[PDB]
């Protein structure tokens, strides 16, 4: 490991020239990091011949690029050769077109001649016209090598939580002279469902038919008390085509109940719509490549369809009148199930006799229930509404899924409604300063979605890659990579998971190549920080994660995940410290990369709901109840870059979501072309949205928050978050927490190692190790 390939590797793998029911393929490694594989080409034996374009994104230390030729026959797997090509030949720019050799294990050659042929060419990241330049013009063409292309003429409504009460957001001034206006997710979903006339298409990891979408007594909507299940049956009865694709976890219902069993009522919902006009379909999810035959058998009950989609037809944005319809779609992190309704208040105890009395979510305690009291787990999340042509791309993703894994041939035929539902159309003129350019992205494979291109040439144009048994759409990871690479001022992430780039982890008690969390997001982040230190340019990265991922915090799963997270932070912090040290700067690396979680703490006021019962005596449950504090769960999957570009979707920053062929995901990336930060700072809708989230978490607006690349900003934000952690973790309680953003409770050693905060080996009120524990039982494929 000596040279750094940070950029893009164009490669074509041609043949072997010799040698002496086969299924034969070839893989590309960068030293030990797999970055590509050809298709299994089959019957053909001696001179097997693939010609596969590869567009590879690199952020790797390497001495050699290595091609391995292998045979995967079910009669038995088998390695053939191993070609080397020192990266020295490739760092320069160049176009290495060798007829390189197919060698063996001691590194002398295989049978008697040939010799693999390959074409390579490496572009460092600075070759890209947008590296360190941002979106840089309203002519920006989008992310390349993706299945969906950028759309123009779109409108995006950014959703902070499921609901926002009146008089919540402060005055946040935006470019056109107007103040930021907050939108209401579930209010808008209720209206879109209520008003549909032709189609309603929904996919979820969980749909619970009993939730009511509208609950704010000071913002009442007629019919709002109806449950989503009864709303959909009413709509279907009128003749609207209501199609649902809800994840089928293929565990049967566990009739018994230990009470932070979070269950995806999948059988219950399918049953709820039986005999109605709603067509609900349980949709199984089998991954593409499960590893061992032994490994595959333990894991293939455990991968999910994770897309949260609602698609409806809606009336034409319109003054009057009259006749016609468009398509409107929703994507983000918010499923239509229990535990997801919340507001930025994120109350622990003060809503249990109002909006949460029959929607009590708390899976981190054994046997938590409303009858025993708080704290509930509050739900911070982010969603979006997409109008304009982009809405039809989400609809089309549903159509590909329904055709491959759905039910009867009952998709609404838009060609038959050409006189009612328009073709995919702008909702605004491109000259309107509110207009959005939006592009859809996915993690999905050919086993879950019909209609992917077949020829390897058409696949590579869409950025699709060959899997074990299916073609793979990984445009979500690619969209994150480009969004990070073009970043020039700051990145703000809120995500449920933050772990990956395991090829660059320290071999510390693990064999890194075993982990296979190969997506690049954490490495592109730290490489981006590194490059701005080197240029003397200001840059900051803020990351908001949950205090711990949902579940009992001592459970093997949570502790495994917290250990992956710790190794990812540790690798990043060593990149940043090494770069700082290389400039002879002695600085706090937390002034360049800073990690947060969320928390609440409420005093007990008179007249609060008093539960009848009580947790058991020395439980995590009882401690939390007495300390009056708990985490605010970060379910967000969102990244804001430079106040000008935003990604919202279902995809977590882990290998499960970023791989392509594990869970199925969806996200949108967008910007407003008239509100870029190329020469001014951007002050459009994405800026107002960031400021509203910051107001929610920090409890205040501050001048410094306008420019988060400034040192003054990151410093003020950390300092405040340190004070909130002290308020949070203190045993005494004088007053409510003034904000929610807590410095993530870890310390960074002077060399990058992650250390425990003195006195906080365990999260407050728990016996769960903040630093995580590697599991002996869970395979990395399940937890990364
Ligand atoms: C003992 C509990 C462990 C705590 C963290 C994992 C919790 C979990 O598996 O959550 C369910 C998850 C999808 O739902 P959500 O997490 O997005 O609400 O299903 C997924 O698709 C995500 C799985 C990601 C990695 C964890 C699985 C071992
Ligand atoms: Ca929130």
Using only C-alpha atoms, the radius of gyration works out to 26 Å
- Counting DSSP H or I runs of 4 or more residues, the number of helices is 14
The class by helix and strand makeup works out as alpha+beta
Largest sheet: 18 strands, mixed
PDB class: hydrolase
Keywords: Phospholipase D, calcium activation, C2 domain, phosphatidic acid, inhibitor, hydrolase
Assembly: monomeric
Entry title: Crystal structure of plant Phospholipase D alpha complex with phosphatidic acid
State the main characteristics:
784 residues; 14 helices; 18-stranded mixed sheet; binds calcium ion; 3 domains; four-stranded antiparallel sheet; 30 strands
Secondary-structure topology with pairs:
Elements: E1 3-15, E2 24-30, E3 33-37, E4 52-62, E5 64-71, E6 78-86, E7 97-98, E8 117-124, E9 151-160, H1 185-195, E10 199-204, H2 228-237, E11 241-247, H3 267-273, E12 279-283, H4 293-299, E13 309-315, E14 325-332, E15 379-380, E16 382-387, H5 390-405, E17 436-445, H6 456-461, E18 465-466, E19 471-474, H7 475-485, E20 490-495, H8 521-535, E21 540-544, H9 556-582, E22 593-601, H10 620-627, E23 629-631, E24 633-634, E25 637-641, E26 645-649, H11 655-658, E27 665-671, H12 685-698, H13 711-729, E28 741-743, E29 746-748, E30 754-756, H14 780-783
Parallel strand pairs: 10-11, 11-12, 15-24, 20-21, 21-22
Antiparallel strand pairs: 1-4, 1-8, 2-3, 2-5, 5-6, 7-8, 9-16, 9-17, 10-13, 13-14, 14-16, 17-19, 17-27, 18-19, 20-25, 22-23, 22-28, 25-26, 26-27, 29-30
The protein binds 1,2-dioctanoyl-SN-glycero-3-phosphate and calcium ion.
EC number: 3.1.4.4
Membrane topology: Peripheral membrane protein
Cofactor: Ca(2+)
